[PDB]
Amino acid sequence: HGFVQNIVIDGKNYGGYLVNQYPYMSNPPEVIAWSTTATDLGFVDGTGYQTPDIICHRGAKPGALTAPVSPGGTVELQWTPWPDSHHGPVINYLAPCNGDCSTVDKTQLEFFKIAESGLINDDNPPGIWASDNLIAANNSWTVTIPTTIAPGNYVLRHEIIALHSAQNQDGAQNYPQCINLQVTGGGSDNPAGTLGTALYHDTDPGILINIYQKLSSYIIPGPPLYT
Numbered sequence: 001h002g003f004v005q006n007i008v009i010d011g012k013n014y015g016g017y018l019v020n021q022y023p024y025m026s027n028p029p030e031v032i033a034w035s036t037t038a039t040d041l042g043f044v045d046g047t048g049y050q051t052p053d054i055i056c057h058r059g060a061k062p063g064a065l066t067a068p069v070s071p072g073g074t075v076e077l078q079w080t081p082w083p084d085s086h087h088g089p090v091i092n093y094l095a096p097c098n099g100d101c102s103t104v105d106k107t108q109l110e111f112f113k114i115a116e117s118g119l120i121n122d123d124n125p126p127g128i129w130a131s132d133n134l135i136a137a138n139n140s141w142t143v144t145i146p147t148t149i150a151p152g153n154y155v156l157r158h159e160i161i162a163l164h165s166a167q168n169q170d171g172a173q174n175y176p177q178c179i180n181l182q183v184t185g186g187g188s189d190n191p192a193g194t195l196g197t198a199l200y201h202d203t204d205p206g207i208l209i210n211i212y213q214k215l216s217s218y219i220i221p222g223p224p225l226y227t
């Protein structure tokens with residue numbers, strides 16, 4: 001359980017969607033982060049993978065603001081303290097807005113995977129995962145925006161999937177957090193994109209899985225990494 005509290009880009013903080021404050025406020029502030037109704041700081045499980053909730057989390061609506069990123073620049077997402085128990089991958093996707101991200105229909109967004117990190121080491125099951133790298137980095141994740149994609153406005157869909165309950169059907173916990181970016185530079189790729197509702201299925205091999213046993217491999221869920 002947790003959420004993104006802050007985003008660091010080009011030497012300043014863009015405050016996150018503080019899901020334990022702003023939903024209680026009813027004239028809340030404009031941010032680059034999408035609003036959600038996930039006030040339990042919880043997740044979308046496999047029962048919601050083919051619902052709109054999977055795209056940018058429960059009840060999500062676009063952020064009003066968009067942050068510019070330098071070419072091949074970094075976006076650092078800072079989480080609330082991530083529990084060690086919530087082992088799993090950290091996955092990052094972009095979807096083009098083809099216009100102002102604040103007015104996009106989230107149900108039409110077509111994501112391409114720009115980064116993935118999974119099972120890092122399994123010397124002591126359940127092992128050390130991307131989520132443990134995030135904890136070791138004091139609960140932050142650095143995303144590098146590719147230089148090879150067409151610049152424009154994009155949604156960054158940044159996600160932890162916790163697998164501590166994933167041996168049961170619909171036990172995997174997805175924590176997607178979306179922010180609006182203005183990608184800059186000289187690139188031209190328009191990568192093949194996947195609808196939010198086709199990212200994950202509740203029987204995927206990296207989703208329905210017992211992490212407590214020795215694992216020989218881990219198949220990071222979602223569509224193929226773009227390079």
Ligand SMILES: *[C@@H]1O[C@H](CO)[C@@H](O)[C@H](O)[C@H]1NC(C)=O
Nearest residue numbers: 132133134135136137138139
């Ligand atoms: C996180 O930062 C705090 C001090 O701000 C430190 O006490 C903690 O040990 C840090 N680093 C890691 C790897 O957890």
Ligand SMILES: [Cu+2]
Nearest residue numbers: 001002042086
């Ligand atoms: Cu939790």
